[PDB]
Amino acid sequence: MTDRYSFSLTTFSPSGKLGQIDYALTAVKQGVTSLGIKATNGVVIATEKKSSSPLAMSETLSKVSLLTPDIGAVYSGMGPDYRVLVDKSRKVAHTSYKRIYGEYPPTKLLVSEVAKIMQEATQSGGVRPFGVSLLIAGHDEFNGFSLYQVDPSGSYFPWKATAIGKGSVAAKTFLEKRWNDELELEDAIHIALLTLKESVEGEFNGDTIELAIIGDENPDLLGYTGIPTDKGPRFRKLTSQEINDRLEAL
Amino acid sequence: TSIMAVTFKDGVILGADSRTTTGAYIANRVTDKLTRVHDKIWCCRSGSAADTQAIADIVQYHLELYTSQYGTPSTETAASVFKELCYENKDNLTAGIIVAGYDDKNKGEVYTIPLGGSVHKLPYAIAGSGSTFIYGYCDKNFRENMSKEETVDFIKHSLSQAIKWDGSSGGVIRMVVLTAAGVERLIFYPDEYEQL
Amino acid sequence: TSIMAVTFKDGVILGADSRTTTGAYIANRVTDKLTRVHDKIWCCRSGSAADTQAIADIVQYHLELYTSQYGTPSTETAASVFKELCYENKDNLTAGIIVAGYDDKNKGEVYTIPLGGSVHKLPYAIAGSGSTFIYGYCDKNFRENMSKEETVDFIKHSLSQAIKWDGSSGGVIRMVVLTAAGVERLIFYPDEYEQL
Amino acid sequence: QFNPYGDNGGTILGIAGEDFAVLAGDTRNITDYSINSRYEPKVFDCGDNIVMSANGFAADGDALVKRFKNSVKWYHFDHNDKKLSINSAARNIQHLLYGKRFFPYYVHTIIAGLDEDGKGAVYSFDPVGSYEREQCRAGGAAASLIMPFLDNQVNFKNQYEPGTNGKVKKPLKYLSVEEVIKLVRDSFTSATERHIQVGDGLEILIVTKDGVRKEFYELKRD
Amino acid sequence: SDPSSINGGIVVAMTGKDCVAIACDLRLGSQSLGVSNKFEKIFHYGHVFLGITGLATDVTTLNEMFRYKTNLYKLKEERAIEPETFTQLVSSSLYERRFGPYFVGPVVAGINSKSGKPFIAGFDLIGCIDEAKDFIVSGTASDQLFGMCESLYEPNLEPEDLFETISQALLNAADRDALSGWGAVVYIIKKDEVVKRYLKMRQD
Amino acid sequence: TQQPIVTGTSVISMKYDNGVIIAADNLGSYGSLLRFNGVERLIPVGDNTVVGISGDISDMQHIERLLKDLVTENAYDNPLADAEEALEPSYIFEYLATVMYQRRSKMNPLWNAIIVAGVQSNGDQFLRYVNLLGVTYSSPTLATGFGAHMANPLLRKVVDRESDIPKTTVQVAEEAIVNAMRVLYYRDARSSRNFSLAIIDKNTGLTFKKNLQVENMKWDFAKDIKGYGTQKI
Amino acid sequence: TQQPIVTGTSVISMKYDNGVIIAADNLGSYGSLLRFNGVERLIPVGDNTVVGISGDISDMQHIERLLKDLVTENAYDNPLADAEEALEPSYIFEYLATVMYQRRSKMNPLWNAIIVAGVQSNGDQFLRYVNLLGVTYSSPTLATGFGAHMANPLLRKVVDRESDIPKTTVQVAEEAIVNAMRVLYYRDARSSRNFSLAIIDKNTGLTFKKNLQVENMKWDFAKDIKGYGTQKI
Amino acid sequence: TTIVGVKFNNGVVIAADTRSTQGPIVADKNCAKLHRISPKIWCAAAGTAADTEAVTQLIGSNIELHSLYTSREPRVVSALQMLKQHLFKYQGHIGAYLIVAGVDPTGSHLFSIHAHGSTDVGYYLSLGSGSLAAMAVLESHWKQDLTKEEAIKLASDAIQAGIWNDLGSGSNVDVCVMEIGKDAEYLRNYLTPNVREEKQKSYKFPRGTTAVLKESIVNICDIQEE
Ligand SMILES: *C[C@@](C)(O)[C@](*)(O)[C@H](Cc1ccccc1)NC(=O)[C@H](Cc1ccc(OC)cc1)NC(=O)[C@H](C)NC(=O)CN1CCOCC1
Ligand SMILES: *C[C@@](C)(O)[C@](*)(O)[C@H](Cc1ccccc1)NC(=O)[C@H](Cc1ccc(OC)cc1)NC(=O)[C@H](C)NC(=O)CN1CCOCC1
Ligand SMILES: *C[C@@](C)(O)[C@](*)(O)[C@H](Cc1ccccc1)NC(=O)[C@H](Cc1ccc(OC)cc1)NC(=O)[C@H](C)NC(=O)CN1CCOCC1
Ligand SMILES: [Mg+2]
Numbered sequence A: 001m002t003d004r005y006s007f008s009l010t011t012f013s014p015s016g017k018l019g020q021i022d023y024a025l026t027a028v029k030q031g032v033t034s035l036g037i038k039a040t041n042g043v044v045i046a047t048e049k050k051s052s053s054p055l056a057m058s059e060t061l062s063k064v065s066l067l068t069p070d071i072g073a074v075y076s077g078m079g080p081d082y083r084v085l086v087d088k089s090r091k092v093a094h095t096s097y098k099r100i101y102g103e104y105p106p107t108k109l110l111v112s113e114v115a116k117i118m119q120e121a122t123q124s125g126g127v128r129p130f131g132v133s134l135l136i137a138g139h140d141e142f143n144g145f146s147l148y149q150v151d152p153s154g155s156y157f158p159w160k161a162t163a164i165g166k167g168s169v170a171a172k173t174f175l176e177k178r179w180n181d182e183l184e185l186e187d188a189i190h191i192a193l194l195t196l197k198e199s200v201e202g203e204f205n206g207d208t209i210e211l212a213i214i215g216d217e218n219p220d221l222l223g224y225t226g227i228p229t230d231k232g233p234r235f236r237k238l239t240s241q242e243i244n245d246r247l248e249a250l
Numbered sequence B, C: 001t002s003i004m005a006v007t008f009k010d011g012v013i014l015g016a017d018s019r020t021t022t023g024a025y026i027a028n029r030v031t032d033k034l035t036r037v038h039d040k041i042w043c044c045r046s047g048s049a050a051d052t053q054a055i056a057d058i059v060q061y062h063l064e065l066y067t068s069q070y071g072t073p074s075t076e077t078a079a080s081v082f083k084e085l086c087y088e089n090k091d092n093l094t095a096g097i098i099v100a101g102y103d104d105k106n107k108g109e110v111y112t113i114p115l116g117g118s119v120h121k122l123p124y125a126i127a128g129s130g131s132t133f134i135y136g137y138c139d140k141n142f143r144e145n146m147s148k149e150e151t152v153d154f155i156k157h158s159l160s161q162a163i164k165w166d167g168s169s170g171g172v173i174r175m176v177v178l179t180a181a182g183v184e185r186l187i188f189y190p191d192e193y194e195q196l
Numbered sequence D: 001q002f003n004p005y006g007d008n009g010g011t012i013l014g015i016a017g018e019d020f021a022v023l024a025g026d027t028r029n030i031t032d033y034s035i036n037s038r039y040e041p042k043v044f045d046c047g048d049n050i051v052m053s054a055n056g057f058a059a060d061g062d063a064l065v066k067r068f069k070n071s072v073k074w075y076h077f078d079h080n081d082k083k084l085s086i087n088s089a090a091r092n093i094q095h096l097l098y099g100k101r102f103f104p105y106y107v108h109t110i111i112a113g114l115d116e117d118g119k120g121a122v123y124s125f126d127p128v129g130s131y132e133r134e135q136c137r138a139g140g141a142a143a144s145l146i147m148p149f150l151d152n153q154v155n156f157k158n159q160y161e162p163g164t165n166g167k168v169k170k171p172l173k174y175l176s177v178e179e180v181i182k183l184v185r186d187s188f189t190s191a192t193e194r195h196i197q198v199g200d201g202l203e204i205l206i207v208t209k210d211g212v213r214k215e216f217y218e219l220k221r222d
Numbered sequence E: 001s002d003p004s005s006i007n008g009g010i011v012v013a014m015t016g017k018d019c020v021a022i023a024c025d026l027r028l029g030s031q032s033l034g035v036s037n038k039f040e041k042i043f044h045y046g047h048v049f050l051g052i053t054g055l056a057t058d059v060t061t062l063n064e065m066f067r068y069k070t071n072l073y074k075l076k077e078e079r080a081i082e083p084e085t086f087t088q089l090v091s092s093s094l095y096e097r098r099f100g101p102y103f104v105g106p107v108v109a110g111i112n113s114k115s116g117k118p119f120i121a122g123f124d125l126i127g128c129i130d131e132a133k134d135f136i137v138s139g140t141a142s143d144q145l146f147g148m149c150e151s152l153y154e155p156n157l158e159p160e161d162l163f164e165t166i167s168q169a170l171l172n173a174a175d176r177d178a179l180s181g182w183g184a185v186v187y188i189i190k191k192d193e194v195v196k197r198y199l200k201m202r203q204d
Numbered sequence F, G: 001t002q003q004p005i006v007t008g009t010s011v012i013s014m015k016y017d018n019g020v021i022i023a024a025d026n027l028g029s030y031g032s033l034l035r036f037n038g039v040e041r042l043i044p045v046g047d048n049t050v051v052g053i054s055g056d057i058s059d060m061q062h063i064e065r066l067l068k069d070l071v072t073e074n075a076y077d078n079p080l081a082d083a084e085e086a087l088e089p090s091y092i093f094e095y096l097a098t099v100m101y102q103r104r105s106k107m108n109p110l111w112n113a114i115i116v117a118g119v120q121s122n123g124d125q126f127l128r129y130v131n132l133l134g135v136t137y138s139s140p141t142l143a144t145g146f147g148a149h150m151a152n153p154l155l156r157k158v159v160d161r162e163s164d165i166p167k168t169t170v171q172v173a174e175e176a177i178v179n180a181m182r183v184l185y186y187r188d189a190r191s192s193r194n195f196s197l198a199i200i201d202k203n204t205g206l207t208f209k210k211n212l213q214v215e216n217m218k219w220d221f222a223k224d225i226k227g228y229g230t231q232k233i
Numbered sequence H: 001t002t003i004v005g006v007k008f009n010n011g012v013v014i015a016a017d018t019r020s021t022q023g024p025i026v027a028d029k030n031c032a033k034l035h036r037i038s039p040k041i042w043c044a045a046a047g048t049a050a051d052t053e054a055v056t057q058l059i060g061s062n063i064e065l066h067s068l069y070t071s072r073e074p075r076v077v078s079a080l081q082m083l084k085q086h087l088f089k090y091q092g093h094i095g096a097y098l099i100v101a102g103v104d105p106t107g108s109h110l111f112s113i114h115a116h117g118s119t120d121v122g123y124y125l126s127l128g129s130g131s132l133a134a135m136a137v138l139e140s141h142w143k144q145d146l147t148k149e150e151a152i153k154l155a156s157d158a159i160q161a162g163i164w165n166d167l168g169s170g171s172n173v174d175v176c177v178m179e180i181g182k183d184a185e186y187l188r189n190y191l192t193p194n195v196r197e198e199k200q201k202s203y204k205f206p207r208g209t210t211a212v213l214k215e216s217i218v219n220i221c222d223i224q225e226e
């Protein structure tokens, strides 16, 4: 009844490869396409809701997750691994930051903490790496808007725009042509919707697409009034209706 | 101790248990806690045995001297003399005394003098460690103008219960009946009062 | 506090006053001291409000987990879980708890768990600061196999007297009736119970 | 155990000018966190152009004042209606207080009036009768808040003449009665803000050669 | 025995117009014995100023602790900690020693470098924040400082006026306290210059 | 030095336009035991003064006798004992204050808090407090014990300062007093429902009301309160 | 470290020619309150041992459960559990003595005094005492609490030394025990009239008598005793 | 401190004074004793100031994480359960006395909790040194079926009784209103009945009044280039 696996399951092979990390990245390649695009006044992150049965209520499976009121994440790869990472990322944002400084962490630092957790799964005893790549979009007062990719190794990189999963090579190329440093958020949403149609086989509507933004403060989503300096979450999940409205001018 | 005095139609009755304790040891199981300070003025004693004796002996002396000079003292007067002693020596005494007496004018009267040396005129009174357990019982079952046989039963049932629940009370139940007829001493043994 | 639980022909009834004290200040005058630990297992709480809550919450948790695994727990089982907590943590707790429940097999049962964490199965039980004043009354007036209306009256009269004499008891009298019929919550206001 | 002392709060303040003196006190009386009264006077005309306050435990304060008033009455009877000078009052009050050296009057006492040259006088006492003449004193609960302000604004402590590097002190001046009442009113407003036992009202007794005058001002009631 | 009055000392901070001031005395003693005349109680981490009164070993220890924490903050965040954030960090750090506390009265002062807003805060020894618009006081002459500040202070003072006001508050409070004084320092803080002045005061 | 044994709780009082009102419940507690249920703690002296007493009842009964003897002694060789040389509230108060402070100064206090309410010769309202320490004070409202904490806030909403006294009628003042007594019955664990109330008016004299009860009590909301938190039934 | 709350008073016992007798009243006191009136403090273990327990009742109930579990555990993988490998009085005692001393050594005693009475396999009488300190001793008579002061002197008049045991019958021993229980009811303020008695005989086995009462009490001389000294009537 | 909670028709209202004390000295004249646990769960705090701030911040943090984990809006009974278990564990040494209130999918709620971990339910509650002054007002003026406007009035009146009659309480009245179906409205300094009067005099000193021994420029910047 004891955990006797106190040795690494990820090790270097003669060629210098860390096989389990490579194999984790292969699981990420098999995963559904997700992407993120940074605009001047916002960030958009998006993915396909590949439903497993049509009897499934795909509304109940949230691929795009709030981590803090100004930070959001989406993934490609193994969904269960993502779900527990989201739980831990939310928690570490409180324990390692908000409970110390009284404010939510900046994006790069929360990314840094998630990266750490993923690196530990790559070296600690008796575990495999996480089989996901994350795209984390966020805003903070001194850095502005940002977009980060996090891989199974624990490595993270900041992006102007990118994509991960199945059709990422094609989607990255599509984004190289359309991205410029003067994009307004609506233009980034429009590009995100165009890029994502290439990677989707079947139905393409607000019920099969999950899309969220980091944009302006939403005081109507806060839940209370009376504190001037609390202006609301910058994270907003677009509704089915809001997505469909933007698909008619497409 | 469990002590009570109850006024009724023809006068007043005093009742007491007979237990004296020395910690958990029963020093005397047939104690007489009802003591005469005048022909028809009696008191029930609770608290320190030494203190209440010393007080009662002084009161008996004061009232015998009152009698020689001014005639028969009232029950209120007897209570006033107990109070003076208990109040002025409150730092040094542990005495809870009930004073009961019969005049022809005032009929039966009951005064209770608790620890601090305040006086309280009442239709009936209860005191001693065992009295806590019968406040409910006595309040529910007391009426004014009871008969002698009713009052004897009220006290017998009340002290029965005090004795049942209080380890510092026990033995026999003694009573003193005070009417125009005179002074009647009653006793009730455990085999009568326990089975009630 | 004044609390009691009384078994009768059709089941068991729990009763309590509604006063919570903070020294001489009444923090809550409409307190609910009767708490459900299972559908037909209830308890009366006396002593520390924090301690008895913490205990009752743990017991409720233990019995909900018992239910999931082994079906409906007996009243004896519920009392055993209270006892374990009270006994093992006797140095750190001030809790006097009465446990009452209804089975179809065992009918109404009452267990009392005083300060030390001993258990005592009884036909009826009383506890809390105010219970001292009604030992005499309750012993004289309790019979087995009373009707529901008789038991409601016995408790109403008993807690009436506890409330009258104890400053730490007061407010409304709450009762919980536990029979095969189900669970009935009763309340009795001062203007009814004082004039008894 | 019985504790024969209590603390009734409040604060008092004496300032002396050239030809006047003031003695001020708040009118609040407290025990623990309760207000007993919003207007219970604490500063008294004692006769012979002497004002007195004994702040702290109000029962001891009232007893002391009562005894000094009586002292003045008997001074008249025994010395042919002679006026009790402020220096003589001070010494008499020392003997009243030191009489209870081993069961003290729990108060801080201030008296004010005019000396025998017509100059303003403030004398100030500890609970067992040590005393000093001063230009300036606060006593009671908010004394620690008020005294340093008075050191600064009455005796010009730590103030230098501008541009003298730091080698010429601000020179001492007597203050006018109007300037003193301003410092008193500000002193008490400041103390009321920060001390829970100070508030409700301010009563100032002003002593000149013409006698004893009173002024009253509201203070915050929270 | 009482750790908050073994060593002595005071700190006061005030806001003016587009400026803050923070001042302290220089004494360190062992009860009646004055030991050092140079024991400063004000430290800075970038542009955020921290005054600490109370037990001197804890004053030193907390300075070293906040130097440590703000150095790491700066490395990870790539910017200097602001006063509002540092105030929260002081509070967190004091409260984590809730049942074995540092015997101190910290005071934060500074100007938010983004918003330009002057900021002061005070704390009790277990981290309760007192964020005041006017002034903050701490130490053995805190009663005396409260009295001086409450009467002398007025809002929107210019740096060179605020200097006179805070210095007179400190000097006169210190003179009515046996365990405070022996020198004083006053920092006047504007958005991008900070003047530090040692006051001439009575040496008893 | 002693400790109080049998005790009385709050005495509450206020001034109104033409007089003073004072009230106190009829209980003598013995620790947590509500021992004696017919104790009068308002004691009239002449037809112009009522002394309301809280704290130790044995010491109250001593004070009662001091006052009774004061009336007897004031009548001696005094043909104006029922007129210009009758006892005043201020005379009775100063006597009690003198005694209280003497007794505290010998470390043997009378363990009481006392309010002397009345009307002087000239029609002035008198209301002053004294306790076991000899501390004395006056105010438009006065209350002892729990009364200080709960009655004063209510009574001060009616008479908050000296200028409010002529604006306050005997009907308004009595209603405030009667309401305050209900609040104390709700909230003071050593209080009772039964109480006495006395009005000393400059026109109508002394009215002394015995056997009042607290009435019109809100208990009805109690039936909706269940458990201490999560318990629904 | 604690303090005992609900308590049981004396347990008394003696040896006679063929066995042992032990008795204890049925009371659970709560200080001076005689709170619980049907408490069994004699606890049989098998058909050869009775453990009599005084002191804290919550700790008694814990010991009761330890003994019940000891019987269960001795039956495990033991085909001779009802014969040669049945629990003996000496085994039960040593177990309890071990526990009592361990508990006192951790400063958390079981607040009890215990007498283990029984008959061994070979017919030997067993009678031994242990308490909260782990102190143990044996004697022809043993008693706890008040029993030590009042019962032992009476029981020792019957069995004063080892050589008196074969001379003492079960009738004589039971009479001495029953008399001792009356004396304790006369004189111990935390005793009751109702008690239980158990005899463990080498021939007739375990006899357990419940609901005994103290009877044939002399109270009659009480009517002649008047006052405390000089009072004649 | 004086803190109160009052239940009304469609919600609950809580109020507090704004004084904090250190001995007999007023440390802060305008503290915020209304602590947000979640957007619609607020509590009023009395007792040891640091303890009340720490306990509400911790439970608020854990309530936020629980709300995210469950995809549900937080309930008042969860805030209450976490507060009671935390406070009970520390055996009264964490001296927080809180009135806990809010709205959630189950309805509107009002609780009190003591430092030792006991909780109460009520239609009206008060805590702190001014709780007796406040409870006198609540016991005299409360009725069932109160409107929002009547409840704000009653709650602020109850705080005012504390402000005027209790030396532990003063300055201003803060309110938070939690109504079913609506955002919680936090009314910071709802009443301001204690503004300090104009001072008689300005104490602004002549420049140069204070004697200086030394000056210097303090380097606040990073290490410079070139
Ligand atoms: C309930 C009971 C039985 O205690 C009742 O109050 C008794 C009244 C009584 C007894 C005999 C004659 C008349 C009246 N009281 C006693 O039995 C007292 C109990 C008691 C002892 C001591 C104190 O001290 C404040 C109060 C009550 N028993 C005695 O007084 C016995 C004879 N003496 C002692 O126990 C010796 N005491 C012990 C305590 O220190 C003083 C000396
Ligand atoms: C008779 C009465 C009213 O006391 C009865 O036993 C109450 C039972 C009750 C109350 C509310 C809900 C459920 C059950 N008990 C109380 O009202 C208790 C009395 C009590 C306090 C403390 C101790 O400590 C050993 C025992 C009994 N009241 C409280 O617990 C109140 C809410 N809390 C306090 O008074 C704070 N205490 C003070 C003492 O130190 C611990 C913290
Ligand atoms: C009316 C009052 C002032 O008591 C009310 O309860 C305040 C509530 C409050 C809540 C949140 C923020 C600010 C204020 N409480 C205070 O102001 C407390 C009062 C208090 C002092 C001391 C103790 O001691 C057991 C309890 C309550 N004030 C403080 O907590 C101040 C800021 N700090 C200290 O006094 C130092 N502390 C005291 C407790 O022990 C640790 C050191
Ligand atoms: Mg009651």
Ligand SMILES: [Mg+2]
Binding pocket: D191, D192, D193, D194, D195, D196, D197, D198, D199, D220, D221, D222
């Ligand atoms: Mg004030």
Ligand SMILES: [Mg+2]
Binding pocket: E174, E175, E176, E177, E178, E179, E180, E181, E182, E204
């Ligand atoms: Mg100095």
Ligand SMILES: [Mg+2]
Binding pocket: E203, E204
């Ligand atoms: Mg010096």
